[PDB]
Every structure is written in structure tokens, then in C-alpha cells.
């Protein structure tokens, strides 16, 4: 899509258009400055030609012979020292012109990106909530930074280079016509071919930044899903199968990468062949033209190099236009998100702002459907009244239409039909900011913003004093534990700081709501995710928060809801019944049913990684030495032809000699072609083999490493897929393409030095003080042509934390009315890189201009000193031109080659990473093969006083003195409070971790003596949220038992016992239905039953059930329980219990607190114990 190019600069403004105009003028009068110095070069070499030829003519001047030849060369001296002024003049001109072009373009880029970025974040934070939960927050997070950087590198600098490139082309072309006539037509007839050569050649010279990521996508998806599901992988073994599937995808990617590399190398070799053929036949025609006395030598040099540089300057423009159009698409996305008109702002200043709100709420004939599916209705004819300060509780069928109440009172959605009113006034007629300010939410899952506790609070209201913060924290029952924190109120919390418990987070959210001082209070399932102990204090805090406020609560578990003033039961978006607790219990309707159911570099190692295929390096390094000392060969035969046109002799020998030189051009072209091809070929294939084997082995060693390594926050899913992909992509280079370029440059410039010191003696001592600055010119010109020095991105990444942190936690920040705070905080950490970009713009402009000027200056200095050398009859013009060509084209060659291969720092530290984790040995080697592995199929489980701390946080204890036995076939239940350590039992029997002290026994045998794969083989895990892989049903189920034939007969029985056979038989394409992001979406309970079948195929003698809150299926939940009860009938089972119904029928219960067993026994015994377990069952009453 387009925008189009007129609306690209829509946010221009007052004076940046002036920078645009002056900048393009500077580019035009910069690009024209290069062909005219080629004209001057033609004229000065014509001067040397005429003088040398005349003095070479007469030589028998005897006697009195010295004075007139010296007068001839005195004419030479003055007629040469007139041109150095021209050279230095265009030097100063190009200096100031280049400065102003670069500075002005980059400056306008900065001053536009600033505005567009602030307005983009202002647009995103001002949106209909319905526009979210549709476009996947993960994409929208990266979109802003990635895409606005993509437009930054596309609108600012590159088009200036485009304009100056077109100016160079037209200047060279007009300076070709105005000086020559015939030869421009033949060079133009050849022109499109070498134009294509340099064009597509530069297209491939660019990057090589993430093109290899495009063909890699499949194995990346496999890697990211398996590394996102390691918990359900390692518990079922399966290292071999996932490793082999990844191996297949990686192998196919390897083959296609080989092919693409070979094709690219062919292209570049053909480019060299064509350019040298062009030189060959061009000088052929030029020689056969000059020998007839038509032109001179200055004209052929001038027009030829002019049209050549014109063609090159056309060839270096395609990356600019392609990046421009790519930024045009990026602009389509961004400007679409900006130019939208959200209808339910929530920021506008239109509606009323009524004061002294009593809180009379009313829903009147509400018909609603979420924007995801308009066909299904959620609310149909809903009518409800809530009197001021009263408390109403809405319960019934899950998913029916309860949370829609909370999401309509905040006016998060408009209802299609009906009216929502506050104090008799329609909600659509009052200001939405003031609406959401007079309302406080308490969402289901509490969120915290990755800042201090204080900033989390005065996100409730920016202008809150610290005393008000203390009082609001005292009302939410959150004070006493905060005083126990290390940094009191300045403790850093969130994703970055210390982890808090769920109840603590929910109470901090309460405190955020309380200082707002709302007149209406909304509670969207305020305590489903919290346990029975954390819910009591939170309920006290909520009851304190309801006092004097009108309240609507949407929540499951109708226990303490008993003290509410009025209840309403929903059924199909309709209130069927309404009244007091004793009234709906007496009604024996929907309410009664629920209530009764309850109750370092190291370079040698980096090279030694590739000890397998050294002959490729040998032949490649030999043909790289050959392709190094064959750059000065062009220089020396160029000097010989330009020189043989500057002496005196028989014409026939001259013609035959030049013919020989031209065919030598063509021969050198052929040799360059073939050696270039096979050089690039062997180094490319070595690099591909290295990256394939290294990526394979790193993935293997990652699969081998235990579970404790997957809790370090620097080791996440994206972190590790980024690590393997990017770091393999970087380590391929530090051994792939460095040797070729370093040997090529040393061979090139050393051959130049020696071939200089043989012929010329004086001038080389001058030019050795000249080579460093032009060597800098090469690499800096390539920095500015590639734009790699612009991408540093440090303070930007130090600022984007608040952007991500505000966008992925959106519902709470938009329900707390914080948009000016986040934009105000987003101003500063963005305005520092503003000034930094200014300083960088100026310094970069002055550097580039300075190096160009120094080039053009030393040009003249070298030619004047060379004019003095030829003045006293001690050095021929061939030699000065030869050493100038050698040294200068050597420096240009080291500039062009020294920055085509990747860098050094990130490469060697990537190698540090890769070797550090490939040498990392696992403590509990799974890939090991030793262990007892007996033939005993019993299943006696026994923990004996295990002592364990999570090595991610070794300061906190989790288990200490935990002892418990599980006999064969029966069921053990584990319950307790928060931080008790119940889920650790499943992870210790899986041997995800080892305990510090104590022992874990299986059939009387310590598991540290058993084979880990076998131990995990006879265990059937059933995780909380069952992970399913992007593949068919049969493969996801067979992934349970690994290394087995598994035929059609074996799948259906497991699917039957999991109670999904009947549901699958009606699905499109029964058991072959592809599951994932592309195929059908199954409900959560159905996913759990697939996990159960996956556990059933293995036929384990032990079954670990790690299930818990909550439950909304209201239909799939009971079937999951049917399958679960079916699986436990004849298997040893350990259950992590949170639902009170499943635990009453277990054979033994264990209550855990602080890693200690407080009490154990059957349901009836621990009920008569009247202790901790008795307290849990009394809550659901």
C-alpha cells in the first residue's frame, strides 16, 4: 500500500521545508562537483603528455643543451602549479556544501520523527478498548519502535544521497557530451549492462542483515514452541523426536541457503566480468580512435571516466528507493493508526461533568454482543437497578453476561440497544474521563506497573501527597507488609523488581482505586485466582472499600457474597431471579444450585570450532591470496597504457602494443571471474556447514540443561530463540569471511608498496603520510552509505521500557485514567535522545565533509610534488601515475573491502556466549544413559524430609523437612496456603530440580541413582495449562510416549479414555484435524483432556495431576473430571489439589505450610480434626 508520497511529509510544519529545499540544493551542487574534477584531470594529464612528448622528441641538443629543456620543464612547472588552485577551490566548495547537505537533511529527519513518535503514542493510548483484544498486543508492542525506526532510516538521509546521485549522473552525462561526442554513444550502448551490474551488485552489497531470517522461519517456529513448552517436553522425554524434527527443518533450510549463496556469488562474479570487458573494449575503441589523430588523451580519459562514474552513481541508488517505498508501507500502517477516529473518547471534552453523584445505577433493555462475533448475543433485554450506596452481586452461568456488566459501566463498549444510566442521566452523555474517574475497578488478575510502589499509587492520581498514600494503603490493609519490605515505599516492583504475592498485588490495586475516591465500585472476579487465606484479608479490605459506595461485583464463589444486599442470577444475558440470599436459596433456582454445590575472545578456540573441514579453508585461502595481489595488476597495466600514450615511436608497434594490453584486460577479467566464484563458494559453504553444526549442537545442549536455567529472567523464550538465531548468525562471520578480506588487503597493499618502491623512490615517502586519512575516508563513506553507524539504540531502549510496560498492561491503566502521566513520562526519556541526535548530526556532517575535503586536497598536493619530481629529469610520468594509482586505489580498495564483512566485537562476544553454553555441563544429565532402570513396575513413592530452595532465589525457603509416602494405586492430595510448596513435589519427582538435603525414593530406590529418562518415562504429568503443539491430534497425543511405532489402533483408545473420542468424531476431518493457530480452536477443558490422553498412551504407573483454579467451562469441566477420575483408578497418583470436590474422595490428604506437613489423613478424619483442612471446606459454605 501507499500513503501516498504527498501525505508522507504531512507533519512537516513551519521551517523544516526550508531545510528540505536548502538540502536538496546542496545535494545538487554537491553531486555536480565530481565530474568536473575529472575534466581538470584530463586537462592536466594532457599537459604532462604534451610536455613529455616534446622533450622526448629532441634530445641531441649539443652543445649548450641544458637550458632550453629546463625552460620546457619550467613551462611544465608553472602550467602545472596553476591547477592546484582549482583543485583546492573545489575542495573548499565541496567541504561546505557536503556539510550543509548532510546536516540539514538529518536535522529535518530528527525534527519530524520527534513529533510523529509522540503523536503515535498519543494515538495508541487514546483508543477504543474494543479495538484491543483483537490486534494482539504482542505485535503492537514491537510495531511502534521497529516501524518508526524503519521510517526514520527511510525518510531522512537516504533521499539526499538519491538526489546527489541523480545530480552526479546528469553532470557526468552532460560533461560527457560537452567534451566528447562519439564515445559517449558507445559507452551508453554498453551502459545498461554495467548499470545492472553495479545496481544489483550494490543491492547485494547492502545486507545481509536479516534476509537469512526469511527462509529460516519454520525451524524458528518449532524452536519457539518447544522452548515455550519445555515443561511438558522434559516431563515426557521427547528430546530425540523434537530434535529430529528440528533437524529436518534445519537440513532443508541449509540446502536452500547453499543454493542462494551460490547464486549470489555467480551474480557478483558476472558483474566483475562485465565491468572488465567494458574497460577492455572501451580502451580498444579509444586507442583505435586516437591513433588516427581524432581526439587527444585528455578527452578520452575525461569522457570515459565521466560516463563510467555516471553509471556507477546510477547503480548506487536502488537501495535508497527500495528503503523509501518500504518506509511508505510502514507509513501506511502508522498513519492508518493515527488518522483513526475513536468514537468513545474517553479523552474528548464534550459530555457533562455532574458533581455530587449519588450513585443510582440503571441498565434498561440492554442488548450487547462483543465486536469479535456480532452473530452471537451475550446480553439480550437486560434490565437492572442499583440504589445509591447499595451492594448488588451478579452470579449465574459463566460466560453468560456478567463481566459485560463491568465492561459496560466503564463504557468500555457501547451497548447496541438499550440505555445505561447513572442518576437518571444516560452514560453516553457524560464526559468519559470524569466517568472513569468517579469509578474504581478491581480486576480479576491484579497488575502492577514496573515502577516504585509510590508511582503505582499516584497512578491512581498524579497529584497525591505521601500522607494520602499512607492513608490509602492503611485502608487497603497493605501497610504492615510494605513496612517489612527492604525499601519501604521506594521498593521497586513489577516485572523488574521483587516478586510479590497475589494478595499483596490485589491490595495495592485496591489502594490505587481508593485514593481516586470513587462514588461507584466495580469488582470483576476480584478473588478467583487467590487462595483461601489470601482471600480473607482482601475481603476485609473490600468491605472497608464498599462502605458508602454503590457497588456491583462480578465474581464466582458465592460464599462471603452472602452478606450482600441483593443478588441477581443471570441466564442467557437475562436476570431470571433477584432478591436476598435467603430468598434465592428459598427460590431454589440458579443461585441455590451453585451455593449447594459448594456448601573474553579466545581466538584459537573460535578457529578450532571448525577443525572438521580444513581443506575448504586451505583452497579458499590460497585463492584469496591470488585475489589479493591481482588488484595492483590492473593498476600497473593501466599505468603502462597511459604511459605508452606519452612517448614517441613507430606507430605500428604502438598499435600492436595497445592491442596486447587490451586483450590482457580481458584475460584478467576472466581470471578474476573464476577465482572470485570458487573463493566465495568455498567460504560460503564452510560458513553454512559451521552454522548448521553449531546451531544443531547448541539446540542439543539447550535441551540437555535442566529446569533451573529457565527461570533467570535473562533466559526467556524470545531471549533464547534470539540467542541461538542471532548468535549463530554472528559467529558464522568471525571465522567465515575475515581471513579472506584480511589476506586480500595485505596482499593488495603490500604488492602496491613493493611495486612502488621498485620504480619510484621519492613520492612514496610522501604518500605514506597520505594513506591513513583516505583509509578513514573509505570506511566512513561506507558507514554513511550503509547507515550502520546510525543504529546504536541505547537510551531509546532505556526509554521503551515504559512504552512496553504501559501498552501490555492496558486495561488497568485505561480504567485508572492515566494518559497524561504516561505521555508526560514518555516526553523526557525521549527528549534526551533528541539533543543527542542533534549533536550526532552536526559531528557526523563535519566528519564526512572533512574527509572528502582531505581527499580532494591531497590529490592536488600529490600531483604537484609529482610535477616537481618529473621536472629535474629523474622520474618518468609512468612512475608517478603508477605509484599514485597503487597507493590511492589500494586505500580505496581497503575501504571498500574492510567494511563489507561483519564487525568484531559482537562476533567475538557471541562466540563467548556460544562456547560458554556449549561447555556448560548439566548437573542432572538427561542425555546420560546410565542409571539402574529396573524391571520393577510397582510404584511406591516416598519423600523423606526434602530440603529445597529455588536456585533462582536461594534466599527464600520453599520446602524444609517435607516427608510423605504414596502407596501403589491410591491418591495423595497436597493442599496448603500460598508459598507452601505443593507444586514443587511434581517438579521434584520429575527431577526438574534436586533437593539440597533429604531424599526422594521410587520403589525404595533413590531417584538420583535411576536413569532420568526412565524415571520421567514412568511419570504422567498433567500440567495446569496444557500446552499443545502446532500439529495434528495424533501427533500431539503420540508426543507423550516417545520412540514407538504407534499405529492407528493405539490412538483411538487413549482418545476414548480421555473423553474426547465423541467430540472428535464430529469435528471436521476427525483425528487428522490440524490444531494450532491455523486450525480449529479448542476450549481449555478439551485441551486438558488431550493432555490426559497424551499421558495415557505412555501407560505410566504414576500419575501427577497439577490442576487448580479456576473453572468457567460449566460443561467441559465435568468431562475433564470424568477423564481424570478414569485415569486414577489403577495408578499411583499425586494430586495438587485446589478444588474441594476432588479431594474428599482421595485416600490420603496432606496439608502443607512453610514446607512442613501440619496434618494428614482422610477426608473424614481431617474434617473431624477441625484444624487447617476443616477451615478450607468451611469457606465454600
Amino acid at each position: 500500500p501507499a500513503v501516498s508520497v504527498l501525505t508522507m511529509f504531512r507533519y512537516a510544519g513551519w521551517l523544516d521545508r526550508l531545510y528540505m529545499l536548502v538540502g536538496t540544493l546542496a545535494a545538487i551542487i554537491h553531486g555536480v562537483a565530481l565530474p568536473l574534477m575529472m575534466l581538470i584531470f584530463g586537462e592536466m594529464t594532457d599537459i604532462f603528455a604534451n610536455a613529455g612528448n616534446l622533450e622526448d622528441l629532441m634530445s641531441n641538443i649539443t652543445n649548450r643543451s641544458d637550458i632550453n629543456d629546463t625552460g620546457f620543464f619550467m613551462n611544465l612547472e608553472e602550467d602545472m602549479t596553476t591547477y592546484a588552485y582549482y583543485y583546492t577551490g573545489i575542495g573548499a566548495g565541496v567541504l561546505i556544501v557536503a556539510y550543509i547537505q548532510v546536516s540539514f537533511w538529518l536535522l529535518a529527519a530528527g525534527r519530524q520523527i520527534h513529533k510523529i513518535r509522540q503523536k503515535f503514542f498519543h494515538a495508541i493510548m487514546n483508543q477504543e478498548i474494543g479495538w484491543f483484544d483483537v490486534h494482539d498486543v504482542g505485535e503492537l508492542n514491537t510495531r511502534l519502535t521497529d516501524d518508526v525506526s524503519k521510517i526514520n532510516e527511510g525518510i531522512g538521509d537516504k533521499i539526499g544521497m538519491f538526489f546527489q546521485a541523480m545530480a552526479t549522473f546528469f553532470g557526468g552525462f552532460i560533461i560527457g557530451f560537452t567534451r566528447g561526442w562519439k564515445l559517449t554513444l558507445v559507452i551508453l550502448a554498453i551502459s545498461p549492462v554495467l548499470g545492472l551490474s553495479a545496481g544489483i551488485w550494490a543491492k547485494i552489497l547492502s545486507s545481509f542483515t536479516d534476509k537469512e531470517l526469511h527462509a529460516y522461519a519454520k525451524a524458528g517456529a518449532v524452536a519457539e514452541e518447544v522452548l515455550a513448552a519445555i515443561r511438558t517436553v522434559i516431563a515426557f522425554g521427547g528430546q530425540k523426536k523434537e530434535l529430529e524434527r528440528y533437524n529436518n527443518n534445519l537440513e532443508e533450510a541449509k540446502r536452500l541457503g547453499i543454493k542462494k549463496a551460490i547464486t549470489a556469488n555467480i551474480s557478483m562474479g558476472a558483474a566483475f566480468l562485465l565491468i572488465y570487458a567494458s574497460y577492455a573494449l572501451a580502451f580498444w575503441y579509444g586507442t583505435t580512435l586516437v591513433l588516427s589523430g581524432e581526439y587527444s588523451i585528455g578527452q578520452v580519459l575525461t569522457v570515459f571516466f565521466s560516463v563510467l562514474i555516471g553509471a556507477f552513481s546510477v547503480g548506487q541508488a536502488s537501495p535508497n528507493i527500495e528503503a523509501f517505498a518500504n518506509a511508505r508501507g510502514a507509513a501506511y500502517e502508522v498513519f492508518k493508526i493515527i488518522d483513526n477516529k475513536p468514537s468513545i473518547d474517553s479523552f474528548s471534552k464534550s459530555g457533562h461533568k455532574p458533581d455530587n453523584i449519588q450513585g443510582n445505577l440503571e441498565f434498561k433493555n440492554i442488548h450487547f454482543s462483543y465486536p469479535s462475533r456480532k452473530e452471537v448475543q451475550i446480553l439480550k433485554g437486560l434490565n437492572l437497578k442499583v440504589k445509591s450506596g447499595q451492594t448488588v452481586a451478579l452470579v449465574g452461568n459463566s460466560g453468560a453476561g456478567k463481566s459485560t456488566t463491568v465492561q459496560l459501566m466503564q463504557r468500555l463498549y457501547d451497548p447496541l440497544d438499550g440505555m445505561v444510566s447513572i442518576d437518571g442521566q444516560d452514560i453516553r452523555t457524560i464526559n468519559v474521563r470524569y466517568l472513569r474517574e468517579i469509578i474504581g475497578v478491581v480486576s480479576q488478575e491484579p497488575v502492577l506497573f514496573a515502577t516504585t510502589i509510590a508511582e503505582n499509587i499516584r497512578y491512581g492520581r498524579e497529584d497525591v501527597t505521601m500522607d494520602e498514600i499512607e492513608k490509602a494503603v492503611k485502608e487497603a490493609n497493605a501497610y504492615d507488609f510494605i513496612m517489612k519490605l527492604p525499601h519501604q515505599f521506594d521498593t521497586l516492583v513489577g516485572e523488574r523488581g521483587a516478586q510479590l504475592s497475589g494478595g499483596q498485588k490485589q491490595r495495592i490495586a485496591i489502594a490505587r482505586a481508593l485514593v481516586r475516591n470513587p462514588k461507584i465500585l466495580l469488582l470483576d472476579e476480584a478473588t478467583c485466582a487467590l487462595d483461601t487465606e489470601s482471600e480473607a484479608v482482601v475481603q476485609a479490605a473490600l468491605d472497608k472499600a464498599r462502605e458508602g459506595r454503590t457497588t456491583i461485583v462480578i465474581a464466582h464463589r458465592l460464599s462471603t457474597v452472602r452478606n450482600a444486599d441483593v443478588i441477581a442470577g443471570f441466564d442467557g444475558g437475562v436476570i431470571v431471579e433477584q432478591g436476598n440470599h435467603d430468598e434465592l436459596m428459598r427460590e431454589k433456582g440458579i443461585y441455590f444450585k451453585l451455593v449447594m454445590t459448594q456448601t573474553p575472545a579466545s581466538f584459537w578456540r573460535i578457529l578450532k570450532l571448525n577443525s572438521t573441514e580444513w581443506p575448504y579453508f586451505v583452497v579458499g585461502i590460497f585463492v584469496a591470496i591470488i585475489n589479493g595481489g591481482l588488484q595492483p595488476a590492473f593498476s600497473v597495466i593501466f599505468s603502462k597504457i597511459i604511459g605508452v600514450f606519452t612517448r614517441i615511436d613507430d606507430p605500428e608497434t604502438k598499435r600492436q602494443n595497445s592491442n596486447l594490453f587490451s586483450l590482457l584486460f580481458l584475460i584478467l577479467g576472466i581470471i578474476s571471474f573464476i577465482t572470485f566464484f570458487l573463493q566465495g563458494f568455498t567460504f560460503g559453504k564452510a560458513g553454512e556447514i559451521l552454522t548448521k553444526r553449531l546451531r544443531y549442537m547448541v539446540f542439543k545442549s539447550m535441551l540437555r540443561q535442566d529446569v533451573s536455567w529457565f527461570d533467570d529472567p535473562k533466559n526467556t523464550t524470545g531471549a533464547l530463540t534470539t540467542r541461538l538465531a542471532n548468535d549463530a548468525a554472528q559467529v558464522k562471520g568471525a571465522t567465515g569471511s575475515r581471513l579472506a578480506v584480511i589476506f586480500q588487503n595485505i596482499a593488495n597493499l603490500g604488492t602496491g608498496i613493493i611495486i612502488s618502491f621498485i620504480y619510484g623512490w621519492q613520492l612514496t615517502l610522501l604518500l605514506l603520510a597520505i594513506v591513513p586519512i583516505i583509509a578513514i575516508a573509505g570506511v566512513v563513506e561506507m558507514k554513511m552509505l550503509s547507515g550502520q553507524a546510525l543504529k546504536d539504540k541505547k537510551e531509546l531502549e532505556g526509554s521503551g521500557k515504559i512504552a512496553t510496560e504501559a501498552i501490555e498492561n492496558f486495561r488497568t491503566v485505561v480504567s485508572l485514567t492515566r494518559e497524561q502521566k504516561f505521555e508526560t513520562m514518555y516526553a523526557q526519556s525521549l527528549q534526551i535522545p533528541y539533543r543527542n541526535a542533534m549533536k550526532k548530526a552536526h559531528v557526523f556532517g563535519i566528519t564526512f565533509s572533512f574527509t572528502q575535503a582531505m581527499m580532494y586536497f591531497s590529490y592536488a598536493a600529490a600531483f604537484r610534488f609529482g610535477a616537481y619530481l618529473v621536472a629535474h629529469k629523474l622520474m618518468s610520468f609512468e612512475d608517478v601515475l603508477l605509484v599514485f594509482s597503487a597507493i590511492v586505489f589500494g586505500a580505496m580498495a581497503v575501504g571498500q573491502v574492510s567494511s563489507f564483512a561483519p564487525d568484531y566485537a559482537k562476533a567475538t562476544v557471541s562466540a563467548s556466549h556460544i562456547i560458554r553454553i556449549i561447555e556448560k555441563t548439566p548437573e542432572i544429565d538427561s542425555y546420560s544413559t546410565q542409571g539402574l532402570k529396573p524391571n520393577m513396575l510397582e510404584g511406591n513413592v516416598q519423600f523423606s524430609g526434602v530440603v529445597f530452595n529455588y536456585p533462582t532465589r536461594p534466599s527464600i525457603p520453599v520446602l524444609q523437612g517435607l516427608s510423605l509416602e504414596v502407596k501403589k494405586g491410591q491418591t495423595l492430595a497436597l493442599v496448603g496456603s500460598s508459598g507452601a510448596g505443593k507444586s514443587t513435589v511434581v517438579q521434584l519427582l520429575e527431577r526438574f530440580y534436586d533437593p539440597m538435603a533429604g531424599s526422594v525414593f521410587l520403589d525404595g530406590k533413590e531417584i538420583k541413582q535411576l536413569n532420568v529418562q526412565w524415571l520421567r518415562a514412568q511419570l504422567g504429568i498433567v500440567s495446569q495449562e496444557p500446552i499443545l503443539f502446532d500439529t495434528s491430534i495424533a501427533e500431539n497425543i503420540a508426543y507423550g510416549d516417545n520412540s514407538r511405532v504407534v499405529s492407528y489402533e493405539e490412538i483411538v483408545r487413549a482418545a476414548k479414555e480421555a473423553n474426547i473420542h465423541q467430540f472428535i468424531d464430529s469435528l471436521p476431518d476427525k483425528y487428522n484435524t490440524r490444531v494450532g493457530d491455523k486450525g480449529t480452536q479448542l476450549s481449555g477443558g478439551q485441551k486438558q483432556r488431550i493432555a490426559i490422553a497424551r499421558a495415557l498412551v505412555r501407560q505410566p504407573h504414576i500419575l501427577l495431576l497439577d490442576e487448580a483454579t479456576c473453572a468457567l467451562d460449566t460443561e467441559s469441566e465435568k468431562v475433564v473430571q470424568e477423564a481424570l477420575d478414569k485415569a486414577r483408578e489403577g495408578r499411583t497418583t499425586i494430586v495438587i489439589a485446589h478444588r474441594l470436590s476432588t479431594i474428599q474422595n482421595a485416600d490420603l490428604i496432606v496439608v502443607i505450610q512453610n514446607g512442613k506437613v501440619k496434618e494428614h489423613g482422610t477426608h473424614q478424619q481431617l474434617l473431624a480434626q477441625k484444624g487447617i483442612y476443616f477451615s478450607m471446606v468451611s469457606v465454600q459454605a
Partner: antibody
Amino acid sequence: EVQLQESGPELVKTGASVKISCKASGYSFSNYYIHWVKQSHGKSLEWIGFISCYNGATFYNQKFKGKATFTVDNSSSTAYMKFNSLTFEDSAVYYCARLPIQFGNFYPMDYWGQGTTVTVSS
Amino acid sequence: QVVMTQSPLSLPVSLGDQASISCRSSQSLLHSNGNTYLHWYLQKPGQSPKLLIYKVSNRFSGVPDRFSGSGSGTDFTLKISRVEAEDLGVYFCSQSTHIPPWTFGGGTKLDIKR
């Protein structure tokens, strides 16, 4: 198509100074040397001298050192020989000739002007 | 100074026959590299002198087929075959070494044999 031209016949009295012209037409004027040569009546052919025809570099022979001077004009493609200290022994026919600068000394003279007759009287 | 001697100075000839002329140096015209340089010129009265044969044996673009030139060392000869009614004028010789003085030869008219 190539052609040289010269002026018309000359009758000049003794002791004065005269100026003679050789105009080129139909080729590249910036390359070729211009050789001035002399011919008396009933003798061999002498050698006045030559100029580079690009920047005015001159060269003479010993017999005529100081009895001539050479100039050029590139805007109109013309060569001039100024001739002073004129005496009687110079009544003769003068020729101007072309030479390629890029490989001289080993290549003949290509073309010749129609020649000018200069008569000296008293 | 390389003086030269040419013969015959005035020779008769009929119509459509052969007529030869000889040019003799005093030095050696053989250059270091294997070449000997002569430049036979034709001159008609009034018009401008043309070029006819250069480098002894070669020809020039635009000459007829009737003209040959041979010789060696310090003796050279030009040969006319089938003399027409158009080749009546003065032929003259040239020399190799530049300064000094790069001199020419005398000249030879043509007579119609009465």
C-alpha cells in the same frame, strides 16, 4: 575532407616587417605540430622551424635564430609567422605543413598549404 | 647535418611505361629498431604537394595502384608503372633523423620523350 590555406602573394619593401598566415580547416586543430618550411627559387628546401599549435612551444634552427617569430590563435584555428629584420635574401615561397604530435619523428608530413610567394624590393 | 643526393635530376619518359628514381644518403638511415624512413612526395605546379609513399614500401590511403618503392641500407628507389597523363610534376625525397636539421631532397621533373 582536410585543407590548409595561406594568404595571397606579397610585395614588401626592404627593412620592414611582414606577417604570414596558415589557416586550417577540417580536422582536430589541437593535436598537430605546425612546421614552417622555406623554398627559394632553384635550390633545396630549408627549415624555418616548428610550433606545438596547442600552447605555443617553439623551436628554431640555427640559420634563422632571431629572424622570425611564431604565434597561434586557437579561437579561429590559425597559425601566424611574424617576420622582421627583412632583407633581400628572403624572396621565396613559404610552405606550412602538418604533423601528428602523438607519434612524430617516425611519421611523414600529411598535408601542405598551397604556398605563399614573398618578394622583397627596395 | 645529413646531406643527400638524388638522381636523375631531369629524366624523360614516354606514356604508360616504367620510370625509376634513386635517392642516396650519406649517413645510415637504418634506425636502431628495424625501420628505414623515406617519404616520397609528389608536387604539381601551383597546387599543394601531396604524400605518395611513406616508409619505403607501404602506401597511403587514396593513392592509385601504379606506384612502388624499394631499397635498403643507404640507397632507395621509387618505381612508376604505367605513367598516365596526370603524374607530371616534381617528386622529392625525405629523411629520418630530426634536429639537426630534418632536411629534404632536390626534385625531379618529367619529360615526354620527343
